[PDB]
Coordinates of N, CA and C in Angstrom, one line a residue:
X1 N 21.3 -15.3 20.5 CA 21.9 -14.0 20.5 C 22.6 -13.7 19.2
X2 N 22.7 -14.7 18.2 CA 23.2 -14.4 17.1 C 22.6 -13.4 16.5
X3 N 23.3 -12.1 16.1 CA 21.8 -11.1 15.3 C 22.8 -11.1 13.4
X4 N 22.0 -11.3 12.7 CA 22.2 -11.1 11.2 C 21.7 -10.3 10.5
X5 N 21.4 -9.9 9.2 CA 20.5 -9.5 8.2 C 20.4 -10.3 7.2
X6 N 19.3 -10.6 6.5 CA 18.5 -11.0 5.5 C 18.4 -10.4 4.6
X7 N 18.7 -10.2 3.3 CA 18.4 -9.4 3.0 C 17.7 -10.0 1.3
X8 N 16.3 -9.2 1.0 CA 15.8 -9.7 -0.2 C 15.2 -8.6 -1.0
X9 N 15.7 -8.8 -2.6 CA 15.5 -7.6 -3.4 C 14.9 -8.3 -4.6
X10 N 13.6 -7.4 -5.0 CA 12.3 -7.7 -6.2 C 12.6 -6.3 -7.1
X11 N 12.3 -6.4 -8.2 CA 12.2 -5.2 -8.8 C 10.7 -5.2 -9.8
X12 N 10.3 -4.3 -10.2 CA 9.9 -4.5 -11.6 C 9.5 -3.0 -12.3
X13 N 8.5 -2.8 -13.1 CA 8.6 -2.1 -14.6 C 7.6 -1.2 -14.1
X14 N 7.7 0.2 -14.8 CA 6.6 0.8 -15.3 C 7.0 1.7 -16.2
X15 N 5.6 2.0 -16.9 CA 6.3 3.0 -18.1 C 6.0 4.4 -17.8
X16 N 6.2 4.9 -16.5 CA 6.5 6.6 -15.7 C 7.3 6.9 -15.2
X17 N 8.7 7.4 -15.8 CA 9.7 8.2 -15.2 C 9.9 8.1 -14.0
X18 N 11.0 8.1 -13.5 CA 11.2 8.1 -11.7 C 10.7 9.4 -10.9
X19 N 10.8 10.6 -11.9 CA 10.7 11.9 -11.5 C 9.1 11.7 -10.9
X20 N 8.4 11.3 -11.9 CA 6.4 11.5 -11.6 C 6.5 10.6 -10.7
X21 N 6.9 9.2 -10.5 CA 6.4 8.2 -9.6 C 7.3 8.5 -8.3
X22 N 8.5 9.2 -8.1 CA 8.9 9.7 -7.1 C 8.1 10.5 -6.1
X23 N 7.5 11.5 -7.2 CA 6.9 12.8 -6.4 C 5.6 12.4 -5.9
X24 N 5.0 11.3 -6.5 CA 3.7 10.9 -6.6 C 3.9 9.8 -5.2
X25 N 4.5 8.9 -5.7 CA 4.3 7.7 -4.6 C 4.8 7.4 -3.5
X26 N 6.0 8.6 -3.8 CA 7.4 8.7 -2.4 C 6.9 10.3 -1.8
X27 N 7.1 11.0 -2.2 CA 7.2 11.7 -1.2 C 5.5 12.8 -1.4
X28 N 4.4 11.9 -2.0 CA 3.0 12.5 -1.6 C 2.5 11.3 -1.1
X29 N 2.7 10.7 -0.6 CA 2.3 9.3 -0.3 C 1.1 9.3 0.6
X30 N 1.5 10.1 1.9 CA 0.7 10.2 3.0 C -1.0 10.8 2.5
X31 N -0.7 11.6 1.4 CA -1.7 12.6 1.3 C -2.5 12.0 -0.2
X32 N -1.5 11.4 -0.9 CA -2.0 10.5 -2.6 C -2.7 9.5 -1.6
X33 N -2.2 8.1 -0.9 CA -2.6 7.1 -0.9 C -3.8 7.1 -0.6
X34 N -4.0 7.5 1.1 CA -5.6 7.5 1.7 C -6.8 8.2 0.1
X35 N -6.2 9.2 -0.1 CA -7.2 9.6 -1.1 C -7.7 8.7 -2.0
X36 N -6.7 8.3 -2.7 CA -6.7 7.2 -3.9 C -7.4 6.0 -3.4
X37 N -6.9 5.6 -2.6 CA -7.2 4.2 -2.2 C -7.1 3.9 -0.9
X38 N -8.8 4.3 0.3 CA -8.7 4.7 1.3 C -8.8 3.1 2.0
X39 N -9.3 2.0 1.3 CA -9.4 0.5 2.0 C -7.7 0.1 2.2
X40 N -7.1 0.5 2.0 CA -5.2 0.3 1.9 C -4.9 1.1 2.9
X41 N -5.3 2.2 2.6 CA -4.8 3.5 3.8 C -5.7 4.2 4.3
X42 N -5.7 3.8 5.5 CA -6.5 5.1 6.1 C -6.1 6.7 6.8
X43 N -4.9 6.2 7.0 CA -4.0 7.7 7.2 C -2.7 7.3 7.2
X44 N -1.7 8.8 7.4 CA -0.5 8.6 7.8 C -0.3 9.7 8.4
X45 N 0.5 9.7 10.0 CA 0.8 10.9 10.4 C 2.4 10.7 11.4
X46 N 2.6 12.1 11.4 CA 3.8 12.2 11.9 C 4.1 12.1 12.9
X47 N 4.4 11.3 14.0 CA 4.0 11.7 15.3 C 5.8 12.7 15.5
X48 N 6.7 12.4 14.8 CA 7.9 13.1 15.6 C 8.8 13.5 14.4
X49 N 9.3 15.0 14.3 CA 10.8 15.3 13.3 C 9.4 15.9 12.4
X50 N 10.5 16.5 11.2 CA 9.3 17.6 10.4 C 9.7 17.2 8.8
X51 N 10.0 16.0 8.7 CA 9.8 15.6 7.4 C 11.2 14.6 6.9
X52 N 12.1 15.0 7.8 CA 13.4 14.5 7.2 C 13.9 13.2 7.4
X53 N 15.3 12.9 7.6 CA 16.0 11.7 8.3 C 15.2 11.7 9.8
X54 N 15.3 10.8 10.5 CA 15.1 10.8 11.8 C 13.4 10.7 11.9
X55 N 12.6 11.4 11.0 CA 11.1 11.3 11.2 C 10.4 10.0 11.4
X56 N 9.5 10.3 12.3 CA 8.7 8.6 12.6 C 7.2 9.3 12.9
X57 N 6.7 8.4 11.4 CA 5.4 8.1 11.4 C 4.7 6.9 11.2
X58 N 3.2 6.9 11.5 CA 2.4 5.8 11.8 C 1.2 5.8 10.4
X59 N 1.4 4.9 10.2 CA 0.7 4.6 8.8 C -0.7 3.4 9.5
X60 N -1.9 4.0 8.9 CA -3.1 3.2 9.9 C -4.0 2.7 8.6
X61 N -3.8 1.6 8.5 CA -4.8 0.9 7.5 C -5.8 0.7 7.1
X62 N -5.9 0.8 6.5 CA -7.9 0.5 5.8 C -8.5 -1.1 6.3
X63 N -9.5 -1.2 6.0 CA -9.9 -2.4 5.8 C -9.5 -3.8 5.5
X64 N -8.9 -3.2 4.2 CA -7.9 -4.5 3.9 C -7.0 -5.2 4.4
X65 N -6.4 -4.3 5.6 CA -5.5 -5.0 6.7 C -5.9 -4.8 8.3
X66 N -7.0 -4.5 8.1 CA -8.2 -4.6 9.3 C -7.6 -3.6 9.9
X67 N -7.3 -2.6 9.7 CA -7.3 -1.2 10.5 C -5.9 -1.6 11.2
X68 N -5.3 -2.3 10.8 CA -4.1 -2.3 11.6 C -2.8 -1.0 11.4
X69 N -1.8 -1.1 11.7 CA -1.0 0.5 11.8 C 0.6 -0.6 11.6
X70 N 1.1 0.2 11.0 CA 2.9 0.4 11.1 C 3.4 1.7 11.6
X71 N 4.8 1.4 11.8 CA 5.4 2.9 12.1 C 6.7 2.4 12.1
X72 N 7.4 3.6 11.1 CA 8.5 3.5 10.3 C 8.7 4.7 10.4
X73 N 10.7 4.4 10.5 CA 11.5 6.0 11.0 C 12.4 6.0 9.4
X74 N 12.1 7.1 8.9 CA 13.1 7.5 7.8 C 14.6 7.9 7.7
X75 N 14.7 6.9 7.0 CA 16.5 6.2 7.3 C 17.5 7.7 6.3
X76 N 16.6 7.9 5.1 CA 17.4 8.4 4.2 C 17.0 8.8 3.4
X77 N 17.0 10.0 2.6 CA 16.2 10.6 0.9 C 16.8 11.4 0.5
X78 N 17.1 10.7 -0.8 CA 17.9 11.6 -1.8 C 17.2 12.1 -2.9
X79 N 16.6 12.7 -2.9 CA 15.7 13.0 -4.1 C 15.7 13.0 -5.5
X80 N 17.6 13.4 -5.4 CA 18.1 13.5 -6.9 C 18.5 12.2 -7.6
X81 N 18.6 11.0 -6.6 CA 18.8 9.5 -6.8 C 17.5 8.7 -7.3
X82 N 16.5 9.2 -6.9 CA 15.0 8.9 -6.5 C 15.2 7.8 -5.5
X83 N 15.7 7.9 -4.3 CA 15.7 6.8 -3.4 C 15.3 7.4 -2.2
X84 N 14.7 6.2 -1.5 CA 13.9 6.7 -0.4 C 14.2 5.4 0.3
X85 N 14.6 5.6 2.1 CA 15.2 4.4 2.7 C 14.6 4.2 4.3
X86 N 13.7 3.1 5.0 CA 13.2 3.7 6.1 C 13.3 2.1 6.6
X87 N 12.9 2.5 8.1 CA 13.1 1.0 9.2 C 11.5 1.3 9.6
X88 N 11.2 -0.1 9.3 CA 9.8 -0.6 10.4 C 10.3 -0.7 12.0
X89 N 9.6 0.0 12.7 CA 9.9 0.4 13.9 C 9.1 -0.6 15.0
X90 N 7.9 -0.8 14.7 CA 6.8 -1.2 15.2 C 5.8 -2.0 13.9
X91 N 5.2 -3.2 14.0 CA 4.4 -3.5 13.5 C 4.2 -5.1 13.5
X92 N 3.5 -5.9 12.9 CA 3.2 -7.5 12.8 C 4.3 -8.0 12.6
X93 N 5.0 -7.4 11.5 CA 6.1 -8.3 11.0 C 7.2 -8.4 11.8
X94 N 7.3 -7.7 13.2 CA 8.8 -7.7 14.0 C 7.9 -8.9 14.8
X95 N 8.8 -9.0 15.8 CA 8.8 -10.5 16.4 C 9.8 -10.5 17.2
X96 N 10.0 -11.8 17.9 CA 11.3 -12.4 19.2 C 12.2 -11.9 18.0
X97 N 12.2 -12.8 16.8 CA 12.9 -13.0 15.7 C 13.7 -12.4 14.7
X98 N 12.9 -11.2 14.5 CA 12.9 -9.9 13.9 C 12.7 -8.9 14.6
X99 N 14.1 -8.2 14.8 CA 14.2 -6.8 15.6 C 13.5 -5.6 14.8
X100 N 14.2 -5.9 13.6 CA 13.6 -4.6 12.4 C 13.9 -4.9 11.4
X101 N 13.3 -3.9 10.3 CA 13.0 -4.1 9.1 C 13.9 -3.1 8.7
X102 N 14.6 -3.4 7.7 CA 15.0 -1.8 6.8 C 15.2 -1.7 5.6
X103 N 14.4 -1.1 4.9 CA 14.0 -0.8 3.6 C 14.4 0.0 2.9
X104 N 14.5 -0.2 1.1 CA 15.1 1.1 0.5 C 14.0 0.7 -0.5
X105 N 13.9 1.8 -1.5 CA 13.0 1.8 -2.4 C 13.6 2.7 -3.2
X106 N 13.8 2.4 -4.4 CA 15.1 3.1 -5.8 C 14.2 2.8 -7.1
X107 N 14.5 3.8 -7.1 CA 13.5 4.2 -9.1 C 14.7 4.3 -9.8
X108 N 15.0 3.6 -10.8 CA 16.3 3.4 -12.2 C 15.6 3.7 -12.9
X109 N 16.3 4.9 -13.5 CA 15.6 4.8 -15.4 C 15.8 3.6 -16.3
X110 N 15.5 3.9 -17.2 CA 15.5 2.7 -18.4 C 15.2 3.4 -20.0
X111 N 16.4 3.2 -20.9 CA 16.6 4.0 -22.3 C 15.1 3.9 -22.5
X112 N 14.6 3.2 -22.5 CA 12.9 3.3 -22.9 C 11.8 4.3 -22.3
X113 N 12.5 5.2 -21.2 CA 11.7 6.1 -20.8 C 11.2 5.8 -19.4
X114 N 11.2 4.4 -19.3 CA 10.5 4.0 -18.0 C 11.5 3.9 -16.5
X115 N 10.9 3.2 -15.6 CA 11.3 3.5 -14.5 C 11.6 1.7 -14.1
X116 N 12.6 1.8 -13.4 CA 12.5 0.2 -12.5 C 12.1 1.0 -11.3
X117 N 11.4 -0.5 -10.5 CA 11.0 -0.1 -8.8 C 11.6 -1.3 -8.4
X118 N 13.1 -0.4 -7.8 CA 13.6 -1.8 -7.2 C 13.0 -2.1 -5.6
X119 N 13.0 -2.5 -4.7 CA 12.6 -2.9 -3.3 C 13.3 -4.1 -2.6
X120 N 14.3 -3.3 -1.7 CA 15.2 -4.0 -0.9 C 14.6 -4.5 0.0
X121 N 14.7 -5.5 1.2 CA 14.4 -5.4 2.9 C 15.1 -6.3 3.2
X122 N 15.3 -5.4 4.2 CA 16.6 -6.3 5.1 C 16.3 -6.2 6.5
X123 N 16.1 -7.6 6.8 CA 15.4 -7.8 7.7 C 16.4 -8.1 9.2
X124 N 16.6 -7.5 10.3 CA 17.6 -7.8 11.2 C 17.1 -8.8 12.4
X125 N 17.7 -10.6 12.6 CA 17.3 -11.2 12.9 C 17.9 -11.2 14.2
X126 N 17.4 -12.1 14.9 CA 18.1 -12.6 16.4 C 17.9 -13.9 16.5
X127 N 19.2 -14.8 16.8 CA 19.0 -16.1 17.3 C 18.6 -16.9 15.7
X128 N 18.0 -18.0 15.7 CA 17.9 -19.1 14.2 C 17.3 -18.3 13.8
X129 N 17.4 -18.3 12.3 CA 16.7 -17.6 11.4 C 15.8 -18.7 10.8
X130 N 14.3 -18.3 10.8 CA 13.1 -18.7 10.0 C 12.5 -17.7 9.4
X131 N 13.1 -17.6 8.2 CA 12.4 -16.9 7.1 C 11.4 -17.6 5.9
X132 N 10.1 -17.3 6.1 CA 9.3 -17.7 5.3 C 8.8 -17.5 3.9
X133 N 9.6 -18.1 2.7 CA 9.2 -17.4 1.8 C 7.7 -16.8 1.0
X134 N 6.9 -17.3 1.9 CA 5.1 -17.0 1.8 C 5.3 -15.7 2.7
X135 N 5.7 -15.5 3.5 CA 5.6 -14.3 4.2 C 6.5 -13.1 3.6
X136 N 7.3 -13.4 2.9 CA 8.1 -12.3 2.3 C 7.4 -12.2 1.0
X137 N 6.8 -13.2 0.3 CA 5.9 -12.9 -1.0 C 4.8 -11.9 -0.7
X138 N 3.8 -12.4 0.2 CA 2.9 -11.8 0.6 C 3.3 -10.4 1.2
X139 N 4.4 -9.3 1.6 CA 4.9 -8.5 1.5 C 5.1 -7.9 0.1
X140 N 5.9 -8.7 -1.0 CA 5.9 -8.4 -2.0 C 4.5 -7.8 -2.9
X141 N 3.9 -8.7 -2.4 CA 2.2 -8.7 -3.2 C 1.9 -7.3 -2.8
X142 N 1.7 -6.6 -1.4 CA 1.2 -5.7 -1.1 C 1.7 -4.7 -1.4
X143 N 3.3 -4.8 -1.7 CA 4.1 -3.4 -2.0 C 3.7 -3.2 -3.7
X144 N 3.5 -4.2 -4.4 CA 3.3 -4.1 -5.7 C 1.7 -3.6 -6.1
X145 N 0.9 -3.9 -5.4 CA -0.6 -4.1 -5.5 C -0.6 -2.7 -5.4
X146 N -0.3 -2.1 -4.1 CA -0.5 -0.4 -3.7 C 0.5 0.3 -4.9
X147 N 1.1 0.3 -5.2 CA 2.0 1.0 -6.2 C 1.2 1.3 -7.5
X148 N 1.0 -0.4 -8.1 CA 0.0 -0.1 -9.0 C -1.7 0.8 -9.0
X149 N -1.8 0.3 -7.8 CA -2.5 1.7 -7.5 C -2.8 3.2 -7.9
X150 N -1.4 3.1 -7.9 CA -0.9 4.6 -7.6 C -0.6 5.0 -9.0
X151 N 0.3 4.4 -9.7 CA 0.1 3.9 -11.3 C -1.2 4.3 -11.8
X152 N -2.0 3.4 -11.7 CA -3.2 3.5 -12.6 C -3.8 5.2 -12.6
X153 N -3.8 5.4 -11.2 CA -4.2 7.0 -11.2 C -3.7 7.9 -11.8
X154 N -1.9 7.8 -11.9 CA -0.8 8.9 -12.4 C -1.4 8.5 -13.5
X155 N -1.5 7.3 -14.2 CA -1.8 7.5 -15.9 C -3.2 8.1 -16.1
X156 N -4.4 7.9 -15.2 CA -5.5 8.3 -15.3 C -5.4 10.3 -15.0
X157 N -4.5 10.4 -14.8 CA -4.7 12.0 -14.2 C -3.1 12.6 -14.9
X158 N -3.1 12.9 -16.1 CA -1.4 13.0 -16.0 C -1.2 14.8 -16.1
X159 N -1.6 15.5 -15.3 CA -1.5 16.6 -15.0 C -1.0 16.9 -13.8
X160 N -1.0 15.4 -12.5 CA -0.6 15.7 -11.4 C 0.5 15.1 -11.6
X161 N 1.6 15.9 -10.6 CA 2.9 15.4 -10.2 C 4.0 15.9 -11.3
X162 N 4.0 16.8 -12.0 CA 4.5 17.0 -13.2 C 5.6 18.5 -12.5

């Protein structure tokens, strides 16, 4: 009955402003990602709320994670911060162990023009904590892999998101 938080934070680099990778990766996400890259995503939809705090949607995966689904309620968005903050509601990664997940995702400038992608999660446990660091990398991999994604396109199209 012991409950905690975990909490683990990755960052790294790109050279696109927070403004384009904000509008691009955070808040067109549902409608950029499946397009871009339909084996990652195969949809996202809203089942409840009309865009804001409180909204809970189901994100349904491609191939690459065998059609499996999340669903995550949006904790928080400040647009002028570039920060965007949400809890896994439902999905593989909760457990006896793990009640929920809660995430933030923060774009920092950088004098060079670029952007940091920082990525928090904090993970809310119950009872011994077994945290695996292969299981939180492998999270890492996927958040980083999809992003770049999304990267490669913003550079390959730089008319959108502007």
């Amino acid at each position: 009955a012991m409950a905690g938080v975990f909490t683990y934070e990755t960052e790294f680099t790109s050279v696109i402003p927070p403004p384009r990778l904000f509008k691009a990766f955070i808040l067109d996400a549902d409608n950029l990602i499946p397009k871009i890259a339909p084996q990652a995503v195969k949809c996202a939809e809203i089942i409840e709320g009309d865009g804001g705090v409180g909204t809970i949607k189901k994100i349904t995966f491609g191939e690459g994670s065998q059609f499996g689904s999340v669903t995550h309620k949006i904790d928080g968005i400040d647009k002028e911060n570039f920060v965007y903050s949400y809890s896994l509601i439902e999905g593989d990664a909760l457990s006896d162990k793990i009640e929920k997940i809660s995430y933030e995702t923060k774009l920092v400038s950088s004098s060079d023009g670029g952007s940091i992608i920082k990525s928090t999660s904090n993970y809310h446990t119950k009872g011994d904590v077994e945290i695996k660091e292969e299981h939180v990398k492998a999270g890492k991999e996927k958040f980083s892999h999809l992003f770049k994604l999304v990267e490669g396109y913003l550079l390959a199209n730089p008319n959108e998101y502007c």
